[PDB]
């Protein structure tokens, strides 16, 4: 009866209890995990998670293969790692022969990014996903990684406003609350904002406002309506030095303004090349 | 000693009704709670409960699962939840909760089933408000002192309010 051999772990046989963790009176296990993204935009990221641990109460010697997929209706009575994002049903099941569980979580959580907003055209927009623990102290689970290949990016995912750089900083973020000691892992996503749009849309037409200053009752409001589209949603020094350029024309110097810009031209390229 | 005795005082007998209050027909049980901000917060309650005492288990600070609490008493506090139990039953208990010029964004923490004189709510005596490590905000943060009293709403209901004193930069 191979149909009554599937309830050997859970239900009337051998007494698995999901509200108690197995391997108790013992050390913390190594819940090694891995992530997978497929599409991020607008900060909104879709994440697929993978996991790995072991316990002696999920072993079997009846079926020879290790890859044994259950349906997603078997998560009601397995031990779950108490995960949630600190900056916040398609669940594949897998039971290996010795007891390894390749459990998975699909993430629809919306992450937020404490990023450097100063040089928004030319910043490494580093963003963090805290995949840290909730329900235990450091006596039942330890967050570690697959030592190579801990982040995978889809090939056709090349969205505008930036690019996703290949190198990613990955280290620990280990938490300390009044409940106890919590394990924490993170992934710094080095997003570099691209050029092109902020030059052609923002810089050049406002550079053109400098060009028809090379009048005074309408070039002041010409810089005003630039803020109608640049304040509703490095860019602020350009809104401030051209705030003086429209007044310097309102207040040698024929060639002096492309020489007063020549000291400002490389001034953008020296600082904002990092 | 196996872990099958977790449903011994629970489960089938010993009179553990998950709705009635501890210290039945007796003293009030005060929660010395404290918060942690990141408005998403993370509140944790802690109270005394001699009903969940034990002697056959040697360790005092053990930990249970977040799915153990469908048959565990809660306070009826209305407006991802774990619990641990001490030796006498000093149950620390938290729920992952979010909450959506010098001003105070007021909070109101009350009971539902019964009035004050069996369920009193409090703060704790040391470090009841907690702030994050490297929290940067859009030039709008809170200062270091956060004064603590009650508000005592009546309908008599308890109250846990905090004056979140803040500043405002340029």
């Amino acid at each position, epitope marked *: 009866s191979p149909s009554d051999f599937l309830d050997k772990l859970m239900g009337r046989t051998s007494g698995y209890d999901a509200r108690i963790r197995p391997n108790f009176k013992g050390p913390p296990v190594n819940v090694s995990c891995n992530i997978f993204i497929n599409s991020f935009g607008s900060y909104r990221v879709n994440i697929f998670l993978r996991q790995q641990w072991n316990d002696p109460r999920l072993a079997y010697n009846e079926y020879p293969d290790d890859s044994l997929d259950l349906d997603p209706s078997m998560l009601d009575s397995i031990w779950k790692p108490d995960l949630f994002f600190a900056n916040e049903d398609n669940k594949l099941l897998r039971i290996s022969r010795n007891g390894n569980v390749l459990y998975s979580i699909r993430i629809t959580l919306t992450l937020a990014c404490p990023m450097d907003l100063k040089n928004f055209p030319m910043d490494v927009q580093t963003c963090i996903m805290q995949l840290e623990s909730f329900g235990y102290t*450091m006596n039942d689970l330890i967050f570690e990684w697959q030592e190579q290949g801990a982040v995978q990016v889809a090939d056709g995912l090349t969205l505008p406003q930036f690019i996703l750089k290949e190198e990613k900083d990955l280290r620990y973020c280990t938490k300390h609350y*009044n409940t106890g000691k919590f394990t924490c892992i993170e992934a710094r996503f080095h997003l570099e904002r691209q050029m092109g749009y902020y030059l052609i849309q923002m810089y050049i037409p406002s550079l053109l406002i400098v060009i028809l200053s090379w009048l005074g009752i309408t070039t002041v409001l010409t810089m005003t309506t630039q803020s109608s589209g640049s304040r509703a949603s490095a860019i602020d020094i350009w809104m401030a030095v051209c705030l003086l350029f429209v007044f310097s024309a309102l207040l040698i110097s024929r060639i002096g303004f492309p020489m007063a810009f020549l000291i400002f031209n490389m001034f953008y390229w020296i600082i904002y090349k990092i | 000693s196996p872990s099958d005795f977790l449903d011994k005082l629970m489960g089938r007998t010993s009179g553990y009704d998950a709705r009635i209050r501890p210290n039945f027909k007796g003293p009030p049980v005060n929660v010395s709670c404290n918060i942690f901000i990141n408005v998403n917060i993370f509140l944790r309650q802690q109270w005394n409960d001699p009903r969940l005492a034990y002697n056959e288990y040697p360790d005092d600070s053990l930990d249970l699962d977040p799915s153990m609490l469908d048959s565990i008493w809660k306070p009826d506090l209305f407006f991802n939840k774990l619990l641990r139990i001490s030796r006498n039953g000093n149950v620390l208990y938290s729920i992952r909760i979010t909450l959506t010029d010098v001003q105070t964004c007021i909070m109101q923490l009350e009971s539902f089933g019964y009035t004050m004189n069996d369920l009193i709510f409090e703060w704790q005596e040391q470090g009841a408000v907690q702030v994050a490590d490297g929290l940067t905000l859009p030039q709008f943060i809170l200062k270091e002192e956060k004064d603590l009293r009650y508000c005592t709403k009546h309908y008599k209901f308890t109250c846990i309010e905090a004056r979140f004193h803040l500043e405002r930069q340029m």
Partner: antibody
Amino acid sequence: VQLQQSGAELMKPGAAVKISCKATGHTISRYWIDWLKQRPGHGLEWIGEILPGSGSTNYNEKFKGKATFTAEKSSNTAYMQLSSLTSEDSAVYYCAMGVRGNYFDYWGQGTTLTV
Amino acid sequence: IVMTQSHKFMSTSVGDRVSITCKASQDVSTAVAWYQQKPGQSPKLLIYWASTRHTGVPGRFTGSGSGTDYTLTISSVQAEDLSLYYCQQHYSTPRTFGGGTKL
């Protein structure tokens, strides 16, 4: 991430001793710092730790009253107040900051006290 | 809590292996840490949770043990580790250190 303490110091019996563990490289209000009593000639034993953000303490039943703590955020220190100095103060006090476990990886150099 | 180190002054030479006993009778956890302390210095970290090694430690210091009696198993003794060392209890609230054993 390192830990630095003050220099040598001496007091009278029954007095109070204030020592600090400066944290240069990280903020003081993030990691737990535990304190030990390294007395030569006897086996070692636990004292208790505090978090400098909340001030919550967890003492041992043997050594309540003797150990008292004090936190400060302006200088990024974690003080250690003492009282009723008996003849067992001949020890070296270490600040043990363990982050990823209850074992202690980030140690201090210690401060020589005796009574 | 039954906790002692029953051996204090053991024999040693250059290039040996030794069996160490941080003795216990009941169960606590598979969570110990061997702190090696030079005389007049701080006890440093060399092993944690009895099997996982910290960055900055050579491959000689390999921890072992399971259950009650745990054992740090060194492979080759040089002239830079003949010193005193301590064990550690983790799964109880009195997190007290071991007795002592000198090479």
